[PDB]
Amino acid sequence: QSACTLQSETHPPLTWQKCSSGGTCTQQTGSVVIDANWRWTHATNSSTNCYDGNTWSSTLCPDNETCAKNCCLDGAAYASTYGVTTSGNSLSIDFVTQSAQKNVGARLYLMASDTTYQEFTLLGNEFSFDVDVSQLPCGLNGALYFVSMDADGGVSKYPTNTAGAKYGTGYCDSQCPRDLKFINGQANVEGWEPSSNNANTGIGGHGSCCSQMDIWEANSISEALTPHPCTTVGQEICEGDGCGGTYSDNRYGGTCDPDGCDWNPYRLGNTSFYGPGSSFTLDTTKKLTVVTQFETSGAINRYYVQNGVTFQQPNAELGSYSGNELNDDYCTAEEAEFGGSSFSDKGGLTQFKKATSGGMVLVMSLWDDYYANMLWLDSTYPTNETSSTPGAVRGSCSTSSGVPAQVESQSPNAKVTFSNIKFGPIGSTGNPSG
Amino acid sequence: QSACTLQSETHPPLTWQKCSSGGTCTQQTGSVVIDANWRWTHATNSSTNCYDGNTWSSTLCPDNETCAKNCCLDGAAYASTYGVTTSGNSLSIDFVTQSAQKNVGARLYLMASDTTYQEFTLLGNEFSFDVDVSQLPCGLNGALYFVSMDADGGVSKYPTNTAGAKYGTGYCDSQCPRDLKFINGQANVEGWEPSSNNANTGIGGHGSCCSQMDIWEANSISEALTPHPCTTVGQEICEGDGCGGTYSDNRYGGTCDPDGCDWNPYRLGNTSFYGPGSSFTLDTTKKLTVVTQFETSGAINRYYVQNGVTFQQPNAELGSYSGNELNDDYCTAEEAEFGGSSFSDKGGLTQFKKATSGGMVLVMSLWDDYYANMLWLDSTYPTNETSSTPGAVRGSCSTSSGVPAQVESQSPNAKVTFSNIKFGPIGSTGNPSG
Ligand SMILES: O[C@@H]1[C@@H](O)[C@H](O[C@@H]2CO[C@@H](O[C@@H]3CO[C@@H](O)[C@H](O)[C@H]3O)[C@H](O)[C@H]2O)OC[C@H]1O
Ligand SMILES: O[C@@H]1[C@@H](O)[C@H](O[C@@H]2CO[C@@H](O[C@@H]3CO[C@@H](O)[C@H](O)[C@H]3O)[C@H](O)[C@H]2O)OC[C@H]1O
Ligand SMILES: *[C@@H]1O[C@H](CO)[C@@H](O)[C@H](O)[C@H]1NC(C)=O
Ligand SMILES: *[C@@H]1O[C@H](CO)[C@@H](O)[C@H](O)[C@H]1NC(C)=O
Ligand SMILES: [Co+2]
Ligand SMILES: [Co+2]
Ligand SMILES: [Co+2]
C-alpha cells in the first residue's frame, strides 16, 4: 500500500530510558504508531473505501496486487478515534472508543524516528516497565511484547509498500496472523473470509510469521510470560493453512510455535501471587513494576517491584523441574506435564535465542479475544477440563467470561497504562533515571 | 580432643537476617567461634602445652590417638588475643594482634547455638553481605565462604572429639588442609613436618576434605568468586599426599578441586571494575554490598551495590563464552583458555550442586599466604608469566608483594569488616531488614 494524507499522522511522543552497565540511565525520545489494520484504507484518488466492515471492494481490490496499487493507508486521530494517549513516559490505551464509528483497542509500535521502528537486542539485557492493570477485567489482554519485525516495516524488501513504519506496516508474530489486510506490499483480499463473529475482521490467504517474546499478557486476574520460537527468525509470508496459528485449520502446521513456553504463576499453582486486593502478593488494583532479564544462556529471569518491595518470579515445581527461571528444563517439563510438542518442535530456547540476539520491535496493545475469549489466560481451558487436569486452570475467571460483544458493552471504559520503560544491561535498570 | 576451661569461651554474638519470598526479613541471633587451630592445646590435667610453636609434645603426643586422649582445646579471648570483635550485625577481624604472643588473623564460623554451627542451604537462595576492604593491602585475603562441615563439628562421628563446634572443630575445605592439628577426633602429629617459613604451623599425615563455595576472597585490589567441587561432598579424611591440595606434592592427586572455577573480574579483563578510589566502578576505599544468587540450574549470579547504585557482575568474553553468569559454559571456556582440568575432573557445577543442595557452614576469615603470597588473587601468577599469557594477570600488585613476614611487619593494623548478612530466596534480600 501507499500512504494518503486526508488525515494527518502525528505519532504520540513517548520517552524511555536507556541504561548502561556503569550505573546511569539517559532519556531517549521516541513515539508510538498504530498498526495499519486499524487505519482507514481507501482509493488513492478519492475517499472511497478499499475495505469496509469486513469486506473488500471487489472493484478496487480484484486481486492482491491491483488492490495494493489502488489503495492507501491514511492517518490516525490517536485520541479521538483510537483512545490512545501519551504523557512523557506513559502510554494509555482505552478499550472501546466511540467516534463516528466504534473502535476496539489498538496495537502500537515504539518508533525511533517518524519513519522507522526502534529495534532492541534483548540478549544480555533487561527490560523494565510499570503497568496499571486495575481497569482490565476478565476477557481483556493488555500486552507488552517484542516481535522480529523489519525497522522499515517492509519497504526495502517490498517496494509496493511505500507507507512503511510511519503507517504501522510490516507486522508479524508467532500466530502467523492472516487477519492482516496488507502483507509484503500486497493486499490480502485473495482467499478473504469475513469473521463469523466480528464485523470488522476476516482471514486472508496469506499470513505473516516471526519470532515473538511475550513479555506481558495480562489483566487484573492473570499474567503470562511466553517466548515463541519460529524456524525462520524474522518476518516471512505464509500461505493459507500452511500458516498454522490460531486461525488456520491446524495451529501446528506452520513455521511458528503458537503455544510457546508460557509461565503463568497461577497456572503453575501459585493462586495467591497476583490478583486484585490485599489478599495477593502483588495487588493488581495498584501500579506494579515488571522486570525481565535475558541472560546469555537463553534462559529468562523475572522479578517484580510494588511499593518498594521486590519479588522474584515465584518458584514452581513441575515434573523434575524446580525453580523460578524460565529455562530449557522448565519448558521440557511443561511439555511433559501439561502436554504438547510445539515449543520443542520449533527449537525451544535455543532457536528463540536467535531472535533475542537480533533486533526486535516493541509492541503495546489492548485486545479481546474473538477466538477463545481469553480463557487460555485467565480461566479454565479447555472449558470442559477440571482442576484435576494438569495446567487447565489459568485464573479465577468463569469459563463463561470474555465474550467480546459482552465485555465491549459492559466494560467499554477498560484501559491499560504502560509507563516508565527502561532498557539496558542486566542489573542496570533499577538505577536512577536520567 | 576434649575441651578445657582454664580460659572461658564466650562466642561474640552476631545477628543476621533471614528473608522470605513474601518480602519481609526477620532477625536471627547467632554468634561466631574461632577455629580449633588458633587455640591453646594443652594437657587435660595441667597447663603443659601439647603443641607449641610448630612442634608437638613427643611425650603427650607420641601418636594420634594418645595425643587426642591426653590433650584439650581451651577458650579464646576473642578481642585481646585474636583481634575479633562484633557489634550487632557487624564482625571485625584484625590482621596482627599482639598480646603475650603474636597472633595472625582468624578463621570463624557462624553458630546456631553455643554448641552447633548454623547450616545454610544455598541452592535456590541468595546470600548478601556488606564488606569494608579498605584496610586490606596486597597480600591479604578477607574471605567469606561456605564449606560442607557437620553441624556438630564431627562429634557424632568421632566420639574422641568431645570439644565440638563450641571449640571450632571439624573444619574441612577444598584444599584438603593438612595443617589442622585435630581431624576426626585424632591428633595429626603422625607425619608432622614443621613449616619451613612459619613458626606457628606445619603439615601432618592427614587432611580434611569437603566442598567449598568461595563467595568472597578479596582485598582492596582484587576479588574472586569460586566454587570448588569434591567427589565426596561432605567432610572426609585424606591420607598424606593422596590428599592433593596446596600442601601435597601433587595438588591434583586427591578428591577435591583446589583450583575451582574462579571468576575474578580483573583476571577476565575488566581492570577498571574494582579498586581503590574514584577511577573504579566499585571504590574499595568505601563499604560495598555483595549479593550472590544460586539458581537451581547450578549456575551462580552476582551483583553489587555501592551508594545505592547497582552493578551486575561485569560481562566477560572468553573463548565461545560471553556473559556474566558463572555457568557450565563459563567454566568449560575457562579451562580451554586459561588451562587446567581440575574443576571438570571433579564434576564441575553438577557435582557442586550437590553441596549447595545440602547444608553448608558460613566461614569468615582473614589470612596471608605462606605458600604463594596471595599472588594468585592480586598479582601476576606464576610470576614469570607476562600479560600475554591468558589469565596470568589477576590484579595490579607487584609479583614481589605479599611476603607474610613483610606484610605482618608493615601492615599489622590491616583488618576486614563484614556486616549486614542477609539470606533468603532469590530476590528477597534487598527488602527491608526486620
Ligand atoms: O475502515 C476503518 C476500520 O476498518 C477501522 O476499524 C478498525 C479495524 O481494526 C480493529 O481492530 C482489529 C482487532 O483485532 C486485530 O487482530 C485486527 O487486526 C484489527 O483489525 C479495530 O477495532 C477497528 O476499529 O477503523 C477506521 C475505519 O476507517
Ligand atoms: O599455642 C597457641 C598457638 O598455637 C596459637 O597460635 C595461633 C595458631 O594459628 C595461627 O593461625 C594459623 C594460620 O594459618 C592457618 O592455616 C592455620 O591453620 C592457623 O593455625 C595463628 O596465627 C596463631 O596465633 O595462639 C595461642 C597459643 O596458645
Ligand atoms: C567493567 O565493568 C563495568 C561494570 O559492568 C562496565 O561498566 C565497564 O564498561 C567494564 N570495563 C571493561 C574494560 O570491561
Ligand atoms: C506464591 O509466591 C509468593 C512469592 O514468591 C510466595 O511468597 C508464596 O509462598 C507463594 N504461594 C504459593 C501457594 O505457592
Ligand atoms: Co500467495
Ligand atoms: Co591414617
Ligand atoms: Co541463569
UniProtKB/Swiss-Prot annotation, chains A, B:
Keywords: Carbohydrate metabolism, Cellulose degradation, Disulfide bond, Glycoprotein, Glycosidase, Hydrolase, Polysaccharide degradation, Pyrrolidone carboxylic acid, Secreted, Signal. The record marks 64 as: Not glycosylated. It catalyses: Hydrolysis of (1->4)-beta-D-glucosidic linkages in cellulose and cellotetraose, releasing cellobiose from the non-reducing ends of the chains. The active site is at 212 (nucleophile), 217 (proton donor/acceptor). N-glycosylated. The catalytic core domain comprises three N-linked glycans which each consist of a single N-acetylglucosamine residue. Glycans are attached at residues 45, 270, 384. Disulfide bonds join 4-72, 19-25, 50-71, 61-67, 138-397, 172-210, 176-209, 230-256, 238-243, 261-331. GO terms for molecular function: cellulose 1,4-beta-cellobiosidase activity; cellulose binding. Residues 384-420 have a biased composition (Polar residues). Its main location: secreted. T.reesei produces two different exocellobiohydrolases. They are unique in that they can hydrolyze crystalline cellulose in the absence of endoglucanases. Exocellobiohydrolases (CBH) that catalyzes the hydrolysis of 1,4-beta-D-glucosidic bonds in cellulose to release the disaccharide cellobiose. The degradation of cellulose involves an interplay between different cellulolytic enzymes. Hydrolysis starts with endoglucanases (EGs), which cut internal beta-1,4-glucosidic bonds in cellulose to reduce the polymerization degree of the substrate and create new chain ends for exocellobiohydrolases (CBHs). The CBHs release the disaccharide cellobiose from the non-reducing end of the cellulose polymer chain. Belongs to the glycosyl hydrolase 7 (cellulase C) family. The enzyme consists of two functional domains, a catalytic core joined to a carbohydrate-binding domain (CBM) by a serine-, threonine-, and proline-rich, highly glycosylated linker sequence. This is Exoglucanase 1. The lineage of its organism: Eukaryota, Fungi, Dikarya, Ascomycota, Pezizomycotina. The gene is cbh1. The chain holds residues 18 to 451 of 513 of the full protein.
